[PDB]
């Protein structure tokens, strides 16, 4: 099981070995419009 | 009127952190403000509450001109005599009670949620809503401070990406939505400061 928490979040990534958050598709893989990520 | 479904138009959203220089002197900086392309709601349930009451079941059961995406593209450009609040104002034709809940979720699961009951002032034939100067929650203090303390940007932005924000704003008598706002966020880069796009949410 991976954890949802706080310390489990910024551990993460700061720690990507230590790692034990659920597992998601990039936002930037995503089927979302090109303005997504081109702020004005 | 981008953020307005038939019965309610949020006018205004802004968090912000305003620090108590002397009795007299305040700077206040925002984190995000806002004061349409659509996108496939499909696409972000995973990042927000599911099963019932949840975004989809929301969604549902409509009406489907009430759901809204926000991107916001968050200032974190600033520094005992701090306030950190969120302030919004709201439109109606309708002399209505409303709730305004605010969920913050994280990778899709609920962590808060703040809710608040916001009453009519008569105001030029139609009627105003203002939730002023709501403390931000001790979460999204710390989530902040969090935030800032990481070494790099692209940090930041790796922690964004599972880190939502959904604000369900209902008649209160009537359980109707009036307003459905999903909040996704990136850091700001910009000389500008915080952005952001608005986006229609729709079902495909
Ligand atoms: C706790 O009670 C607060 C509930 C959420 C308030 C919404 C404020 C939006 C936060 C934006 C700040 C920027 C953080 C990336």
């Known amino acids: 099981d991976s954890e949802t928490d706080l310390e489990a979040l910024f551990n993460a990534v700061m720690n990507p070995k230590t790692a034990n958050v659920p597992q998601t598709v990039p936002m930037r893989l995503r089927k979302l419009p090109d303005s997504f990520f081109k702020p004005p | ?5 038939s019965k309610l138009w949020m006018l205004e959203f802004s968090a912000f952190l305003e620090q108590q220089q002397d009795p007299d002197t305040y700077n206040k900086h925002l984190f995000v403000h806002i004061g349409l392309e659509a996108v496939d709601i499909r696409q972000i349930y995973d990042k927000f509450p599911e099963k019932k009451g949840g975004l989809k079941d929301l969604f549902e059961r409509g009406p489907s001109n009430a759901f809204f995406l926000v991107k916001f593209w968050a200032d974190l450009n600033t520094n005992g005599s701090s306030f950190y609040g969120v302030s919004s104002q709201y439109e109606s034709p309708e002399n209505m009670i409303i709730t305004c809940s605010t969920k913050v979720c994280s990778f899709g699961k609920q962590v ?25 929650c001790e979460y999204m203090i710390n989530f902040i401070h969090k935030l800032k303390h990481l070494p790099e940007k692209y940090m930041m932005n790796s922690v964004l990406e599972n880190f939502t924000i959904l604000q369900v704003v209902t008649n209160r008598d009537t359980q109707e939505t009036l307003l459905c706002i999903a909040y ?21």
Request: charged fraction near 25%.
């Open chain 2, 1 to 5: 009127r981008s953020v307005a479904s």
């Open chain 2, 112 to 136: 808060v949620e703040k809710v608040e009951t916001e009453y009519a002032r008569y105001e030029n034939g139609h009627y105003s809503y203002r939730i002023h100067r709501s403390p931000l």
């Open chain 2, 184 to 204: 996704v966020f990136e850091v700001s880069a910009s000389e500008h400061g915080a952005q952001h796009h608005i986006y229609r949410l729709v079902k495909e």
